[PDB]
Amino acid sequence: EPRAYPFNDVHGLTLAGRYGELQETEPVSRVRPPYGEEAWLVTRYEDVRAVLGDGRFVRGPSMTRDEPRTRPEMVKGGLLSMDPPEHSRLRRLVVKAFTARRAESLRPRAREIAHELVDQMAATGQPADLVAMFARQLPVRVICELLGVPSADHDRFTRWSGAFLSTAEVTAEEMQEAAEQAYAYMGDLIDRRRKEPTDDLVSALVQARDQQDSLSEQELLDLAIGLLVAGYESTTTQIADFVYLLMTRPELRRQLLDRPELIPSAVEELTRWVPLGVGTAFPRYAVEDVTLRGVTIRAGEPVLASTGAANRDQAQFPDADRIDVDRTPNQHLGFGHGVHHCLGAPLARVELQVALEVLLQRLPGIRLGIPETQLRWSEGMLLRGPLELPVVW
Numbered sequence: 180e181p182r183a184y185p186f187n188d189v190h191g192l193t194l195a196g197r198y199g200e201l202q203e204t205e206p207v208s209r210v211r212p213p214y215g216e217e218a219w220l221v222t223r224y225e226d227v228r229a230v231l232g233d234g235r236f237v238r239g240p241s242m243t244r245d246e247p248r249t250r251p252e253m254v255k256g257g258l259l260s261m262d263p264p265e266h267s268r269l270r271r272l273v274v275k276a277f278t279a280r281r282a283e284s285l286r287p288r289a290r291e292i293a294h295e296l297v298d299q300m301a302a303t304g305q306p307a308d309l310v311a312m313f314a315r316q317l318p319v320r321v322i323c324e325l326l327g328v329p330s331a332d333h334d335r336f337t338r339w340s341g342a343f344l345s346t347a348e349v350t351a352e353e354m355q356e357a358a359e360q361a362y363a364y365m366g367d368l369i370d371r372r373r374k375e376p377t378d379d380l381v382s383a384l385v386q387a388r389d390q391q392d393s394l395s396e397q398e399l400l401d402l403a404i405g406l407l408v409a410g411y412e413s414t415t416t417q418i419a420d421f422v423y424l425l426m427t428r429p430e431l432r433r434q435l436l437d438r439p440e441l442i443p444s445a446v447e448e449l450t451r452w453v454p455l456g457v458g459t460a461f462p463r464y465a466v467e468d469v470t471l472r473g474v475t476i477r478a479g480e481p482v483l484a485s486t487g488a489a490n491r492d493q494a495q496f497p498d499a500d501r502i503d504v505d506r507t508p509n510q511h512l513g514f515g516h517g518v519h520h521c522l523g524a525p526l527a528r529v530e531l532q533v534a535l536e537v538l539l540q541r542l543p544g545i546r547l548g549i550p551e552t553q554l555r556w557s558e559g560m561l562l563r564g565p566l567e568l569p570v571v572w
């Protein structure tokens with residue numbers, strides 16, 4: 180009886196037709212994922228939003244449960260495996276340091292970084308791989324700048340960070356060595372910023388307070404590496420997917436060339452439209468029986484709340500499959516919802532807006548250097564995105 184899940188094909192960004200069918204006829208349904216427990220799948224915008232904001236659906240069981248998932252290993256921990264009130268304390272300290280103003284202040288340095296990466300890419304001649312040379316470089320260098328990793332160390336830090344991408348081809352030994360290097364480096368950096376604070380995020384984390392509460396040494400190190408892995412692969416993959424869309428959809432490209440002031444709205448529209456996850460990814464667990472659209476979800480059972488499907492619900496977004504760069508309103512769930520809503524979103528927005536702005540300004544002719552049908556797509560099974568994007572201009 181449960182349906183085989185995921186439904187999305189990883190070899191492209193199409194939203195599986197099953198989601199729309201289920202939104203009509205079985206909005207709360209049973210799925211059997213490749214690994215982990217069978218689970219409830221929730222597909223309507225209203226219900227996804229409700230699940231992600233409902234106090235009765237928690238993340239703590241992630242720490243021990245056989246979580247519904249697409250890969251054989253379990254990745255657990257960090258802010259996203261915590262529930263209030265433990266979650267609330269850590270999140271309050273982080274956001275006090277990691278402000279929207281701090282994110283906005285990184286725009287000039289993100290633009291300089293993007294310009295340098297295009298310089299480097301263009302110096303390799305055509306076609307050049309936009310994934311290797313740009314998308315996989317900008318977000319980790321911006322996280323370096325955000326944390327306060329000195330310039331001289333961005334290359335080595337970027338190298339270690341590459342080992343944590345779901346697309347990496349590294350042995351267990353190599354990945355272990357990269358993790359050890361990164362945590363040792365970050366622990367040192369924290370220790371130096373406590374002794375001699377600067378204006379960067381690591382210093383602001385060390386000094387964040389709520390009355391007498393503060394982050395411990397171990398919370399600081401875990402949170403800083405947490406920010407890196409949460410803010411790297413997502414952003415990289417979304418850059419790659421957004422430019423893939425601009426290169427393949429002439430009118431979309433034309434509208435942003437002709438009105439670059441549309442880029443921030445376009446970033447929101449493409450965040451809504453792109454079903455970036457292969458599945459849903461972070462199951463919620465009922466703390467008690469809950470009735471959702473007439474179906475009883477029993478205490479303990481996992482629930483997969485599809486933001487990809489929710490963001491394409493025709494009930495919430497008029498003509499939901501059209502990319503309308505000027506769409507208003509646009510209350511999309513592509514940076515989540517409820518207490519776990521993306522705390523890097525302000526920075527992610529600056530990166531994505533800068534990535535489009537600079538690529539379109541420097542390479543307005545940018546296009547696929549190979550037929551679209553020949554693209555190699557990631558089989559990492561977490562996010563959907565091209566493994567390489569050969570581009571010409």
Ligand SMILES: CC[C@H]1OC(=O)/C=C/[C@H](C)[C@@H](O[C@@H]2O[C@H](C)C[C@H](N(C)C)[C@H]2O)[C@@H](C)C[C@@H](C)C(=O)/C=C/C=C/[C@@H]1CO[C@@H]1O[C@H](C)[C@@H](O)[C@@H](OC)[C@H]1OC
Pocket residue numbers: 252254255256257258259260342343344345346347349350351354358405406408409410412413561562
């Ligand atoms: C696709 C995005 C996620 O990528 C991931 O989930 C990346 C997972 C990769 C695939 C893992 O690496 C693979 O592990 C296998 C055992 C072997 C395989 N090779 C070596 C043969 C190897 O490639 C994991 C275990 C790698 C390590 C370094 C790791 O823990 C990386 C985690 C990255 C998490 C990324 C972001 O998710 C964040 O996960 C946290 C656990 C959450 O708390 C939350 O962060 C705040 C979430 O970001 C919202």
Ligand code: HEM
Pocket residue numbers: 258259260270405406407409410411413414417455460461512513514515516518519520521522523524526527
């Ligand atoms: C295009 C890029 C990004 C997208 C699409 C994205 C999306 C998401 C989503 C959908 C969630 C909620 C996951 C859930 O509740 O299951 C999340 C949480 C999170 N994001 Fe992002 N994110 C992006 C970039 C970033 C960046 C740049 C950072 C750090 C600088 C960041 C840090 C985090 C953290 C720490 C969480 C966990 C929050 C919590 O559990 O309290 N993300 N993000």
Ligand SMILES: [Cl-]
Pocket residue numbers: 292320333
């Ligand atoms: Cl850099």
